[PDB]
């Protein structure tokens, strides 16, 4: 039972690490896209609520 619980914990930790790596990769891709296109296009979103 302890081995099964450890396996479940390891699976959860692996899923968490995969999510963190995916978030880091998405952040890097978004940063590259912002550097290429330019953040100025987001300025129009300032009037959504303000």
């Amino acid at each position: 039972a302890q081995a099964e619980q450890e396996r479940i914990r390891m699976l959860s930790e692996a899923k968490s690490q995969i999510a963190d790596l995916v978030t880091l990769t998405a952040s890097r891709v978004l940063g590259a896209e912002l550097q290429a296109r330019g953040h100025d296009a987001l300025i129009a979103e300032s009037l959504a609520a303000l």
Partner: protein, 55 residues
């Protein structure tokens, strides 16, 4: 003579019973300890195998 024989027989019976009980108790304790040690070793081996499979 009858009194002496009765006393000797009672003493011998008590000694034999005590020796048998002590020997049986010691054997049972040794067997239990060996079984517990073997169980601990088997549990450790199973845990190691499960950890390797999970890794």
């Amino acid at each position: 003579e009858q009194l002496a024989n009765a006393r000797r027989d009672y003493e011998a019976e008590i000694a034999r019973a005590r020796q048998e009980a002590a020997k049986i108790v010691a054997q049972a304790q040794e067997r239990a300890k060996q079984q517990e040690a073997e169980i601990i070793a088997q549990a450790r081996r199973e845990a190691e195998r499960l950890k390797e499979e999970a890794r």
